[PDB]
Design a protein around this ligand. Structure first.
Ligand SMILES: Cc1cn([C@@H]2C[C@H](O)[C@@H](COP(=O)(O)O)O2)c(=O)[nH]c1=O
Ligand SMILES: [Ca+2]
Ligand SMILES: [Ca+2]
Length: 341
DNA sequence: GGGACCCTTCGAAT
DNA sequence: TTATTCGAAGGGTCCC
C-alpha cells in the first residue's frame, strides 16, 4: 500500500488570509466567542505568526490577548471554511478513487494503483500541492508512507507547506526512535500512562506483557500500538460515512431550570435537523456540559426513525433525567442524532 | 461462551 | 477553559 495524506495548513486562519490577503504576515487568531463576558471563549486556531508567541488552538481568548493584544482576532466562520474544504476535497478526488476524508482539513488517498514507487508518489504530492495552490491559493502539507499512521506522522513532521515520504526503512527507524507521544491517537492521558510503564517508543510495546499493556491503556490501543511496532498496521482507506450529527450550545448563564434550558435545547434540535438533511435518525442523545466542564449524556434508541416532533418531546425527558441524576448546574446543552436509516 | 445490541463515559482528533 | 465527530471501554440485557 502507498498512502498519500493531505493536511491543510493552519486551515481556518489561512482561509481568512485568502479572503483578506492584507492579513498575511500578521498574527491571525480564529476564535469561538461564547458571549458570557468580554472576550469569553477559546481560540479555534491561529496562524504560525501567532503560534510563534504561544497563541494556539484551545487557549482562552483572554489569555491570547494578554500575549498578543494587537493580533487580528476573527470570529469563527465554520460555514465558509467548510465550503473551501469541500472544493479542495473535490480537487483531491481527481488523484484517487480511494479517498478517506478524516476531517475538514485531512484526507487520506490510497495511491497504490496510481504510482509504482515513492519517487512517483513524491511527484504526485507536488502535483497535488501545486493544484490546490493554483485553484484555491491554499498551502497544504503532504505525508507519504506505507500506511495511514506513518503518512500522518510524515505530515506532522513536514508542516507547514511541506511534503515528506517515510520509506520502509525510516518506518523501522521510527519504531525505535520516535517518541510514542507523537503517534496519532496517543494524547496526554495515554502518553503519561505509557511513561509510567517505561514505554517511550513503539518498540517498547513488544517486551511488556500484553495483559499489562491492555490493563493500563485498553485492548484496542494496545493492539493498535503493537501492530504498529510490529510493522503490521495497514488499515484500509475507506469512504467515511457520517454516523452522527449534533449541536451543542453555551448558555448565557449556567442553570438547572427546565424552562430556561428548553429554548437552547430546542435551538440545538432545529440546527441538528437542518444539518441532518434527508437522513433520519433512530437514536437521540441529549448532552449536557456541567459547570465544572464535565460531560453528562442521556439518550434513547427508538425502533424507527425520529421525527422532529418526537425529538422535541423525547429530548425533554432525557434532559430531566440529567437534572434528576446529576446535582450540578448545566453550562452547555446539546443534542446528537445517530443510527441513521 | 459469545452474539447483538444498548447505555454512558472517556480520550483523542480536527 | 469552543464545537464537532469518532471509536472504544466497560457496564449491562436477552438470547441461543
Ligand atoms: C482545538 C481545535 C483544534 N482544531 C484543529 C486541530 C489542531 O489543533 C489544529 C490543526 O489545524 P491547523 O493546524 O490546520 O489549524 O486545529 C480545530 O479545528 N478546532 C478546534 O476547536
Ligand atoms: Ca491542518
Ligand atoms: Ca500526542
Amino acid at each position: 500500500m502507498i498512502v498519500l495524506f493531505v493536511d491543510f495548513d493552519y486551515f481556518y486562519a489561512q482561509v481568512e488570509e485568502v479572503l483578506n490577503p492584507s492579513l498575511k504576515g500578521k498574527p491571525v487568531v480564529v476564535c469561538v466567542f461564547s458571549g458570557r463576558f468580554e472576550d469569553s471563549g477559546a481560540v479555534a486556531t491561529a496562524n504560525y505568526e501567532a503560534r510563534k508567541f504561544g497563541v494556539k488552538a484551545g487557549i482562552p481568548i483572554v489569555e491570547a490577548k494578554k500575549i498578543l493584544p494587537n493580533a487580528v482576532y476573527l470570529p469563527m466562520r465554520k460555514e465558509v471554511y467548510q465550503q473551501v474544504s469541500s472544493r479542495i476535497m473535490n480537487l483531491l478526488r481527481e488523484y484517487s478513487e480511494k479517498i478517506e476524508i478524516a476531517s475538514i482539513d485531512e484526507a487520506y488517498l490510497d495511491i497504490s494503483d496510481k504510482v509504482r514507487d515513492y519517487r512517483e508518489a513524491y511527484n504526485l504530492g507536488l502535483e497535488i500541492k501545486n493544484k490546490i495552490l493554483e485553484k484555491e491559493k491554499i498551502t497544504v502539507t503532504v505525508g507519504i508512507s506505507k500506511n495511514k499512521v506513518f503518512a500522518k506522522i510524515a505530515a506532522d513532521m513536514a508542516k507547514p507547506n511541506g511534503i515528506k515520504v517515510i520509506d520502509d526503512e525510516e518506518v523501522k527507524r521510527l519504531i525505535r526512535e520516535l517518541d510514542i507521544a507523537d503517534v496519532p491517537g496517543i494524547g496526554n492521558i495515554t502518553a503519561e500512562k505509557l511513561k509510567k510503564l517505561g514505554i517511550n517508543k513503539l518498540v517498547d510495546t513488544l517486551s511488556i506483557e500484553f495483559d499489562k499493556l491492555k490493563g493500563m491503556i485498553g485492548e484496542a490501543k494496545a493492539k493498535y500500538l503493537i501492530s504498529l511496532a510490529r510493522d503490521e498496521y495497514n488499515e484500509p482507506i475507506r469512504t467515511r460515512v457520517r454516523k452522527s450529527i449534533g449541536r451543542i450550545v453555551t448558555m448565557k448563564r449556567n442553570s438547572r431550570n427546565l424552562e430556561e434550558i428548553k429554548p437552547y435545547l430546542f435551538r440545538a434540535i432545529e440546527e441538528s435537523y437542518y444539518k441532518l438533511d434527508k437522513r433520519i435518525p433512530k437514536a437521540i442523545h441529549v448532552v449536557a456540559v456541567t459547570e465544572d466542564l464535565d460531560i453528562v449524556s442521556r439518550g434513547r434508541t427508538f425502533p424507527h426513525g425520529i421525527s422532529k416532533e418526537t425529538a422535541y418531546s423525547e429530548s425533554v425527558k432525557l434532559l430531566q433525567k440529567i437534572l434528576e441524576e446529576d446535582e450540578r448546574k448545566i453550562r452547555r446543552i446539546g443534542v446528537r442524532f445517530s443510527k441513521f436509516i
